[PDB]
Amino acid sequence: MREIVHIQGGQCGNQIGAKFWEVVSDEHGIDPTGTYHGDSDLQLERINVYFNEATGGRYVPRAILMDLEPGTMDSVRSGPYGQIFRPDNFVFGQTGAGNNWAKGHYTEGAELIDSVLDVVRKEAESCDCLQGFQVCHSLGGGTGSGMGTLLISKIREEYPDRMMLTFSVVPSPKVSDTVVEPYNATLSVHQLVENADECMVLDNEALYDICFRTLKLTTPTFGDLNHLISAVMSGITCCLRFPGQLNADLRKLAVNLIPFPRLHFFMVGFTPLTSRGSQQYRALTVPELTQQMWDAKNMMCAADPRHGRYLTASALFRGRMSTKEVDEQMLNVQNKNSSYFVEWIPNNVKSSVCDIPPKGLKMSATFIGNSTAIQEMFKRVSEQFTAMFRRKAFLHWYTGEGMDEMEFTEAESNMNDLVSEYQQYQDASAE
């Protein structure tokens, strides 16, 4: 009865959202035709968080897909679970943004944004009570980053009190896809800092590392990365949808994770990720889950937590488990690694337990870490943005869309202030 409005933006966001909705329908026993085939009462108990019952037995996702080009949405509709989405929730333009945040935020995103807000408001008023909105998209792309930031600003204006969660795919450190990724990321982070209440940073290169080293896959397509992202996206809200021994909703996670309003960027990870070869070799225990959880290799962020200091960390476990086991494990983690945890917070862990593990896994756990390590990621993005902006390369493409040069430097200043805050609380001393 606490509803969540899902939004997908851009090609990457739409692919991630399609994978996520496939995973959630699998969890709730919903076939691609919408009918329930789960044979479990708890699956239908809280289905209204994500789905709405149609006239018949069909359940439609409370999902809204936005894009400037129709190809990605055509692929999503033709995918295996493409028919569950209501066709009216596919809001697409005709000319895509050429990796241009200006095109997706000011020129071309402006006309489609009112249709998008019409759909969002229609979905929101249908909700009895609204937990908030979750927007999945990629920083470093035109329509995704631009229209996502624009929509987030609009939704923040309309519903300031409602929760806002973002799954942003930050451009990767080493191998960058497009040239203008630093520009788009710089312009998007400035919006997310001011608007998004909760932000989860994902890096495709961290995803490749985790799927090459833990999963040990040989040919990881984008589908596998979207699968891991979908696993985290489900596990963050499974405490809403399923009974929990110690349940914790999105707002509780935000309250326990965010010390100060601007420090709301988080790195996430999912456990247990096991290679098909080592599945029988590994033993499923709470200590094993915690061990993989706190491994820096498990973080789906490029930045590693070792360099920074953990301000806070939430751990949402799933499965029939011992609260004594979980609490003792998190206490031992904090005591062993006290150097990596902030001193002026007596307990840096928000432990939550859900009684329903994901399908196939006896146990699972998602980790949400607010640590000053994200500082180095923003610093790298700024190191690219400044190099490009000094000579104003490709700046004419953003200028021709009618955005001030001062806007770039304002976004850079906001990023630098955020980095400064993270460093301040990294090296803050008690008393």
Partner: protein, 430 residues
């Protein structure tokens, strides 16, 4: 929805258009009669109620022979007869003849047909202008057409696949003259200009295809494969789709700097095919090899500013990422200090179709690398002395003056090419 209007001006434009449209017909399954036994063809073909597909192309030339060859050959039931526009008198390698006297009525009719074509397109990604810098028809009429298109259509992205004269080898004598004139014209109208050199493509054919007698058909087939790889992301779905509009955003740092080197890989005959692994890293290296450049311009002299890679076939993002990381770590490949990323990778799930009758082998992977690099100023440097050497004596200048030009036009073109040289030097410098 993703329509692109193809223009082929002059003999070279039409002869590369023949290869391009044969390749498109083979790729989309369209028989030469016009119809094939969805909507991936809409970029290049418009379907009628009868089911027969007509290309959205325009064959423009002031000479009747080349166009009549198309009208008589196999693709006579494919193309639109009025879209094939034929002149009466050739431009005779005279830019003035093709731009001031003969080209007027022809370009008026060309704009008429271009309006008729664009009226049938819901969307319009842009224009693909295929001409020959170095001939009166291609240079003069093409320049006039590009100017008219810029005036009327406005911001539509015009991609000009131009063929400049080779450094040493050439077929004309007034080629520096009309090349300088047309370069002056197209510096300010085309959005992304792709350089092509006959000498470089001849070298590619001789070294990679082992063709001791390369010819214009082989050159056109290579160019057609390159343009097909360029447009593959418009017609076939794949991870990391790249668009005509995204070319300019990820490749053009500044409006004057939009000339691009093009390199295809692999270029292997079937006898040499399946004799090497042809992995993604190896094809990327081959694409970045200077010999694989289709312009006689060593990239070692300059520095790369941007590189858009278009992968076709069984290509995985992990492999494109590993190859691009190796390229970045590579020392001989040098990038400008102000572009840290400098890479635009885009993959497509459609392997390059092989033209029966061609020399290219059926390879499951392909790369088309289109790069903005400051080395390209070297070719303009060559033409800038090839021009002034003749201009000192005003040789052949009476020919150009006779059709209503002035010494001021030559002076302005030379000055603008010098300014382009200076701009390339300035972007290369820190």
């Amino acid at each position: 929805m993703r329509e692109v209007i193809s223009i082929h001006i002059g003999q070279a434009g039409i002869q590369v258009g023949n290869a391009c449209w044969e390749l498109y017909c083979l790729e989309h399954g369209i028989q030469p009669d016009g119809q094939m036994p969805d909507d991936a063809f809409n970029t290049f073909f418009s379907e009628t109620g009868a089911g027969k597909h007509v290309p959205r192309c325009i064959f423009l030339d002031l000479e009747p022979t080349v166009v009549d060859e198309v009208r008589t050959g196999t693709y006579r039931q494919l193309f639109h007869p009025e879209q094939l526009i034929s002149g009466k008198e050739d431009a005779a390698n005279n830019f003035a003849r093709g731009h001031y006297t003969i080209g007027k009525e022809i370009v008026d009719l060309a704009l008429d047909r271009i309006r008729k074509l664009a009226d049938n397109c819901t969307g319009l990604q842009g224009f693909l202008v295929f001409n020959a810098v170095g001939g009166g028809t291609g240079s003069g009429l093409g320049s006039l057409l590009l100017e008219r298109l810029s005036v009327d259509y406005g911001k539509k992205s015009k991609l000009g696949f131009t063929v400049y004269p080779s450094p040493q080898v050439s077929t004309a004598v007034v080629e520096p003259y009309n090349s300088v004139l047309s370069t002056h014209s197209l510096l300010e109208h085309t959005d992304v200009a792709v350089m092509l050199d006959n000498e470089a493509i001849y070298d590619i054919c001789r070294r990679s295809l082992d063709i001791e007698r390369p010819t214009y058909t082989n050159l056109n087939r290579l160019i057609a494969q390159v343009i097909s790889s360029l447009t593959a992301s418009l017609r076939f779905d794949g991870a990391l789709n790249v668009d005509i509009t995204e070319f300019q955003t990820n490749l053009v740092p500044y409006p004057r700097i939009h000339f691009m080197l093009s390199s295809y890989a692999p270029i292997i005959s079937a006898e040499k095919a399946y004799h090497e692994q042809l992995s993604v890293a190896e094809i990327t290296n081959a694409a970045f090899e200077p010999a694989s450049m289709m312009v006689k311009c060593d990239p070692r002299h300059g520095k790369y500013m941007a590189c858009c890679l278009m992968y076709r076939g069984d290509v995985v993002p992990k492999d494109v990422n590993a190859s691009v990381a190796t390229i970045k770590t590579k020392r001989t490949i040098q990038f400008v200090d102000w572009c840290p990323t400098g890479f635009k990778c885009g993959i497509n799930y459609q392997p390059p179709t092989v033209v029966p009758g061609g020399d290219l082998a059926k390879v499951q992977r392909a790369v088309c690398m289109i790069s903005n690099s400051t080395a390209i100023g070297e070719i303009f440097s060559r033409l800038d002395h090839k021009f002034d050497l003749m201009y000192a004596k005003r040789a052949f200048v009476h020919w150009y003056v006779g059709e209503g030009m002035e010494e001021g036009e030559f002076s302005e073109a030379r000055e603008d090419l010098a300014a382009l040289e200076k701009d390339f030097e300035e972007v290369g410098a820190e």
